[PDB]
Amino acid sequence: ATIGRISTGSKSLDKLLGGGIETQAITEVFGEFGSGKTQLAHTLAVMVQLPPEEGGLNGSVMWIDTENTFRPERIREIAQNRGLDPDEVLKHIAYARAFNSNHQMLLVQQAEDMIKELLNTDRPVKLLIVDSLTSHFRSEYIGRGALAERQQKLAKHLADLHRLANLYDIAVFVTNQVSATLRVYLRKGKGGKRIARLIDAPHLPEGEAVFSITEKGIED
Numbered sequence: 001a002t003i004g005r006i007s008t009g010s011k012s013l014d015k016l017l018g019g020g021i022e023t024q025a026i027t028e029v030f031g032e033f034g035s036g037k038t039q040l041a042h043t044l045a046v047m048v049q050l051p052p053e054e055g056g057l058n059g060s061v062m063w064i065d066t067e068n069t070f071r072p073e074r075i076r077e078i079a080q081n082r083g084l085d086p087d088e089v090l091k092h093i094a095y096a097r098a099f100n101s102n103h104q105m106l107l108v109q110q111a112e113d114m115i116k117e118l119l120n121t122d123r124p125v126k127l128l129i130v131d132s133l134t135s136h137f138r139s140e141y142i143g144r145g146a147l148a149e150r151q152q153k154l155a156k157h158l159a160d161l162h163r164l165a166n167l168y169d170i171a172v173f174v175t176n177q178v179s180a181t182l183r184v185y186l187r188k189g190k191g192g193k194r195i196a197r198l199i200d201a202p203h204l205p206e207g208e209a210v211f212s213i214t215e216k217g218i219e220d
């Protein structure tokens, strides 16, 4: 399948990314609290449900939440301000809380079942979010005695995600805090704007994009 792209809502950020976030890829977005990474997550969960002409892939979403940062009311707001139906948009976001790192890995392994079910329907899964990729791993595996196992499990987790992305033509989007992944770093700009910087992309030049957070989620 040809690589599909989902608009982030921001034309500036889309340009930096070569058009939007890619299917068959993991996009990994870093940022401190208030950087805009979870807002970008929420915006993508809406955008992907649009037709390609509007920057989406006519897709469903699966959302794995590790620290209780998913906000249904924010989905509704973004959906409505983009002229969409907030109830329909929310219905097509499948939600799962991950309680710990083992559970998080289990959820990704078993996510394949639902992806298979939706694969040849009108709303195949096109976005899988893990927000956030590392909070549980960082919490559970403390100090140098734990590092080896931590990296092992995380590596396996990322491999499971890459496989789902590649096999089923899904854009995987994960958040983190400071290949395999396309790494984007968010920071505060001036006047409440945010800045994204792309780093170490094999086939996209490094660069920066300034964007805003609005009732539409993110946009220029």
Ligand SMILES: Nc1nc2ccccc2s1
Pocket: 062, 063, 064, 094, 095, 096, 106, 107, 108, 109, 110, 111, 112, 114
């Ligand atoms: N195994 C998984 N089931 C679900 C359900 C909703 C969202 C994400 C996931 S991952």
